[PDB]
Amino acid sequence: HMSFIKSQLPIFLNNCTQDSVINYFQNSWELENILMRSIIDDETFYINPDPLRNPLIFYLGHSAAFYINKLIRVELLEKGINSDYEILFEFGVDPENAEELNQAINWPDVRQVWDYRNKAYEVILEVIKNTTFDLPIHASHPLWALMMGMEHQRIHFETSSMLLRQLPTEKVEKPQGWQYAPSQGVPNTNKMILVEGGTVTLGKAKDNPLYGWDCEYGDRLVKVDSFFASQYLVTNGEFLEFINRKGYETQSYWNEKSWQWKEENKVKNPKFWQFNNGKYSYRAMFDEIPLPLDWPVEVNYYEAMAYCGWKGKGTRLMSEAEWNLAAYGSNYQVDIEKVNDYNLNLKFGSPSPVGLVKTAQSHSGLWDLRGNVWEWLDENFHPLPGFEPHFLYEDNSAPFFDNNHKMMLGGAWVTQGTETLKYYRNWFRPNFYQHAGFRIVTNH
Ligand SMILES: [Cl-]
Ligand SMILES: [Fe+3]
Ligand code: NA
């Protein structure tokens, strides 16, 4: 599995020494550099390959400016590097339509943004070397702003990889050591497993010794009834059957809003499939390859539900509490080394065959609940009891408690940092594409 490109595991706040944080910060930054350096021509940075996201030049500068802005806010920095750039690159976008984004969106030169990145790197490195790391770090400690910036950089490694995937292959260059998972051919039978009901506690305590975003915190007990879930995420080969049974052409599997999305975008298959010469090819990060039939299918929420509609019989997606019960049970002390047991943290540079990582079966019997691809949940993004916005970033999650965003959990092959662990709560508009799939659920 992928070894040459290595991502350092997250660190407990009780062990966030200066030396360990230097290593984690250096690793977070060098990883993003490797991804951004995969674009061959500078002119490509002014394309926005995802029509619902900013041009690539924005994301080249956004991670660096985020660090600077948060460090200034806690007064660990007395001035920025470029106040215009810190405004321009301050916050991203989350539009419902490409027309909204186009109306909203003069960009600087690529070389100028790279120079800003390099200056910002040296400025943060000097802050780290000149600040006392009095253990333990915590949410009211000034260094929380640094913990925030590193996790924000690592999330944008994930979200930018999806933008580069939407560029033509001729515009990107695979980094040395990038390795896709193998494919074993057709997948095994995807059996439904009974998950025994139980009570779960959602949320994270304020004094938990791990960095977290504001929406992670709170406390909610939820009694979860028993339910059936497929042992594997739905595979490309399973979704091919859906296509061959006219899944995209039957309104009864969709609803008015999702059908409208499909029609307006002329969708006939998942985004990274392409039909040519009788067969589907598949677009990995940098190459088009024969469709890996045993990999989890990558779809948006509309497509996942349309598949559930074709299955019928009340087939549905899990709730947040059901996923937590299946993944972590009713008990919990996080063990960071367990990240190595799943397709997380660049173990592979792609999704893997369901069940290939033999250490990736949860105690519930379900495979790749953690890792491989994010999995969609029928759960509107919402706060847990006790939620409180952090003063450093009050708009992080509160604007998205709008019943217009569905959640996803578990992490993907590209996921790094604290986002690979138990408490991270992820959310997207249901039409949006991520490294995300789904499994199916029935009550009986
Ligand atoms: Cl764990
Ligand atoms: Fe951001
Ligand atoms: Na998963």
TrEMBL record:
Residues 189-441 form the Sulfatase-modifying factor enzyme-like domain. GO terms for molecular function: formylglycine-generating oxidase activity; metal ion binding. It comes from the Bacteria. Keywords: Metal-binding. The keyword Metal-binding applies. Mn(2+) binds at residues 62, 152, 156. Fe(3+) binds at residues 62, 152, 156. This is Sulfatase-modifying factor enzyme-like domain-containing protein. It comes from Crocosphaera subtropica (strain ATCC 51142 / BH68). The lineage of its organism: Bacteria, Bacillati, Cyanobacteriota, Cyanophyceae, Oscillatoriophycideae.
